[PDB]
Ligand binder design. Structure first.
Ligand SMILES: [Cl-]
Length: 309
């Protein structure tokens, strides 16, 4: 259990796309952002590592280590200060993703928490939920996949604290994504991303599936809302990794060649829920899948449950 990075109240991230469709990356800006947000990405990667180690069994120490890191950031007010804006809103996106990583790690390890840790961490996760929700009050912030990802931290906080109000907030975010799917299966804000259209349909599916999976922890089946619409979207993604011709024509660009990885691991859960599960076998074979922003090892969580016994 090494020492945590500092948890500053403040964030200063850098946007890295060159074009109107935010589909081509400037590698100099990407390197600059990577260095600027390194504490946030190292925090998320470590707490997910500790949670995965706890889930193997016979390692309560790894679970307690995650809680030590979360408590330290809670007591320093991490991410609750200034979101600095340089060339876009990357600082706010980073707060959305890192809140998700922290809240997932707490949900997986909270059985081991002390009294003081519970109060410290749950208070911090609720303040982050309120701050992230307030960003979307401005109607000029377009509610694409960043909005769905904001729902990850709100929903994990809701389940862990048993807050029916935050639970209703998250259900609204999930339903807004489901309602955006068109009859032909597209999400229009993601189809606008040219050679990354397929990439961002995959990336928008991931948080919607994860909130639905978290809802099973309170016995609810969110896949009955507009039943079948999420399957049309997921089927287009699986089809697209086989043959991208539909994404090519509807986006106006040839899709960037890529293998499924990281957050593509939503398929590990969803193949257990679909009426046509073997359609997702080709994507499954690219695994195992790990993503700290989704709680860690998705291949193992789909078999063993999100929260270890
Ligand atoms: Cl600045």
């Amino acid at each position: 259990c090494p020492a945590p990075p500092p948890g500053s109240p403040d964030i200063r991230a850098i946007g890295y796309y060159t074009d109107a469709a935010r589909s081509v990356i400037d590698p100099r800006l990407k390197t600059q952002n990577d260095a600027a947000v390194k504490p946030l990405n190292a925090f998320a990667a470590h707490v997910a590592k500790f949670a995965d180690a706890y889930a193997k069994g016979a390692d309560e120490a790894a679970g307690r280590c995650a809680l030590t890191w979360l408590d330290a950031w809670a007591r320093s007010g991490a991410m609750l200060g200034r979101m600095a804006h340089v060339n876009n809103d990357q600082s706010d996106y980073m707060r959305q993703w890192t809140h998700g990583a922290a809240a997932m790690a707490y949900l997986r390890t909270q059985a081991l928490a002390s009294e003081q840790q519970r109060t410290d961490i749950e208070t911090w996760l609720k303040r982050l939920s309120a701050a992230n929700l307030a960003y979307w009050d401005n109607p000029k912030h377009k509610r694409n996949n960043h909005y769905y990802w904001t729902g990850v931290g709100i929903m994990a906080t809701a389940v862990a604290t048993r807050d029916d109000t935050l639970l209703n907030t998250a259900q609204g975010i999930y339903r807004a994504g489901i309602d955006a799917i068109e009859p032909d299966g597209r999400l229009p804000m993601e189809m606008a991303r040219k050679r990354l259209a397929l990439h961002f349909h995959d990336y928008a599916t991931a948080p919607l599936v994860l909130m639905a999976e978290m809802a099973r922890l309170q016995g609810e089946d969110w896949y009955t809302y507009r039943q079948g619409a999420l399957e049309r979207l997921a089927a287009r993604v699986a089809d697209g990794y086989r043959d991208p011709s539909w994404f090519n024509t509807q986006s106006g660009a040839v899709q960037e060649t890529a293998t499924p990885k990281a957050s593509s691991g939503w398929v590990e859960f969803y193949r257990l829920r679909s009426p046509d599960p073997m359609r997702f076998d080709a994507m499954h074979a690219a695994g195992p899948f790990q993503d700290p922003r989704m709680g860690g090892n998705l291949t193992l969580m789909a078999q063993e449950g999100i929260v270890p016994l």
